[model samples]
Target: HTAVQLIVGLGNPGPEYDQTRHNAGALFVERLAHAQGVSLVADRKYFGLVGKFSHQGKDVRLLIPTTYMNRSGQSVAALAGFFRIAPDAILVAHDELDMPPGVAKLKTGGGHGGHNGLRDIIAQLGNQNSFHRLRLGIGHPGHSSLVSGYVLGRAPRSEQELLDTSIDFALGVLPEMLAGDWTRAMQKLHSQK
Candidate 1:
């Protein structure tokens, strides 16, 4: 029963990408850090902003890559490798296209599903796909050709509210998750509206 040791949020850097649908993962980490009163400091070696705090007496780390989305693995691999954290002990929160706003899901050990960030993370981890994933749904743009632009664009206020609700829901179950109660956490998160 491996517990999550590192929480990584995948997204591109810079203020231009802030609050965009593609940056949902990064946003989640930032919110989590704020809630825990942890400050993420820029860390060149990790290629990201890094923070650490103990949850229920267990040490946990958080990261938001400063690299572009496609090169996210550089940050993830750097931190995970240095900490000797196994793939399964890391949970990556990222935007998902297949589901609609207000929906989020948790899964482990899967393919990239056309996500560049996941692709790079998997490759950088020696083709390992065992890491946990927190999929924050941003909804599809109704066509694959429009996906690139759609994700990079800002969500409408309506959708943004839903996304925020989902993030809050995920946060609610985080303690259960950190305690290695994956089944309980999944049930609670997946049951959300």
Candidate 2:
């Protein structure tokens, strides 16, 4: 296990995807940076916006892949390759249909579970599922066929507020996470419930 070197928030790159439940991961990253008065700069080389911040003497890079959702791996592979960053050193935050809105959880080394962004990333990394993941819940729509439309839709204001609260908790716990103290981070988050 390694401390996080890079964190990527996965979402489609366009205003059309903005404010939708599908962009929960991106929302978390943007809000966290905004809270700290930092801004992500558009970086063509990495095919995304890139930013940096420090925690306990360690430099951590933040990214929002400009690649649309399904092709996220294109950007992910480009940056990870250039920096020689291993899969285990990266954390990917993305929407989770299995969980309800306002819930967020972290895990690693699991199958993609049919998320295209994850599927592509797994393919890019030679099917290794070692990377960490921050899963932001975007409640499912009951039927498998409705999954896509459901995620792309907007959440109610009340649930949106809860999602924001969840993000706040995640940001609060990030230092522990970045330090590779996953147990500490998880305990803090889980206990918040």
Candidate 3:
């Protein structure tokens, strides 16, 4: 058995992006760090804040790309290279606008669904083949014209009710992922009920 390392969250920088659909990745990683009493130190080498922590003999690394949402792969791939973690061991947590709120999907190999951040990941990684995704659903806004504004915009009060719970749920799965127990993790931690 090998360690499931490198938990990467995709999100933009700046306070304005804080709670946006695209920022869910960063938020989840932050929650995990908070729970473990660890802080992400500035890592200029990866162009992101990175923290390494161990749990139950497993070494786990958390990443938040400061490269914003659109070019997240650059930092992710570099870190993946540095640590020699396989694409499968790299779990990406991010928002999926196509899925309904509070729903999450864990999968490997798929299209990016028109997300620039994900597209960059696919492009740099050289394959869209499913890697593990800790999907956070950010339901589409009512109007198409507002897609940009919606994803980058703050989550509404009603949506926050759902988002907050999702964060907690995902954080609970980190230990399982680190322990390489995806089956149980998915069953016990990845929940929408």
Candidate 4:
């Protein structure tokens, strides 16, 4: 188990996507950047808004891909390749359709579960599915056909508030995560509703 070297937030690029359920992952990273006082700058070479900050005496990289959701791998591969970061050392954050709002869970090494962002990322990373994941819950729309619209749409105010709570909770356990204390971090995050 290696400490996470890079944290990538998955989302489509554009102001229109702001506050949408599908951008939950990117929103978490933005809030994290705010709390850490790190400013993300557009970096063409990395294909994303990139930033770096010290966490527990270790330098951690942050990225939010500017590519559309399905093509997110381009930005992630660019940055991770430049830094020589391994699949295991990267953490990808994305919205989870299987859980309700206000739920966030940490896990490692799995199938993409039909997520375009994760699918592309897995394909780009040489099919090495060992990367960690921070799954931010955005409750499903109750039908497969409605998923696309549901994720693209803004959450109701009440659900948005719940999402915010989950994000804050995840942020609180970030140090445990950065310190390579995976079990502790998972326990803390999963224990929450």
Candidate numbers sorted by lDDT from highest down: 1, 4, 2, 3
Q: Candidate 4: which pairs clash?
A: none
lDDT of 1 by residue, 1-193 (tens): 7778999999988878988999999989999999999999999999999999997677799999999899999999999999998887899999999989999899887888899998999989966348889999999999889999999999999999999988999999998778767889999999886
Off by over 4 Å in 3: 128-130, 142-144, 189-191
Q: What is the C-alpha lDDT of each candidate?
A: 0.91, 0.83, 0.79, 0.91
Candidate 3 lDDT by residue in tens digits, 1-193: 3456888889999877777778887888888888887789879898898998886676788999999678899988889889887877778888878776776666666878877887888877878344677788888887878888888888778887787677777776666767667787778865548
Error of 4 at 107 (Å): 1.0
Model 4 scores worst on lDDT over the 10 consecutive residues at: 123-132
Which tens-of-lDDT digit does each residue in 1-193 have in candidate 2? 4788888888887878888887888888798778766689999998898888876677678888888788888888888888888888888888888887778888877888778888888888766448988888777889999988888888899878888877887888887778878888888886777
As a TM-score, model 1 comes out at 0.97
Once superposed on the true structure, which residue ranges of model 4 sit more than 4 Å away at CA? none
How would you encode candidate 4's per-residue C-alpha lDDT over 1-193 as one tens digit per residue? 4788899998988889988999999999999999889999999998889999986677899999999999999999999999898988898999999989999999888888879999999989967458888999999989999999999999999999999999999998998877767799999999986
Candidate 4's displacement at residue 138, Å, is 0.4
Candidate 2 segments whose C-alpha is farther than 4 A from its true place: none
Summed backbone clashes in each candidate are: 0, 0, 5, 0
What are the runs in model 1 whose C-alpha is more than 4 Å off? Answer: none
lDDT of 3 at 74: 91
Model 1: per-residue Cα lDDT at residue 41: 96
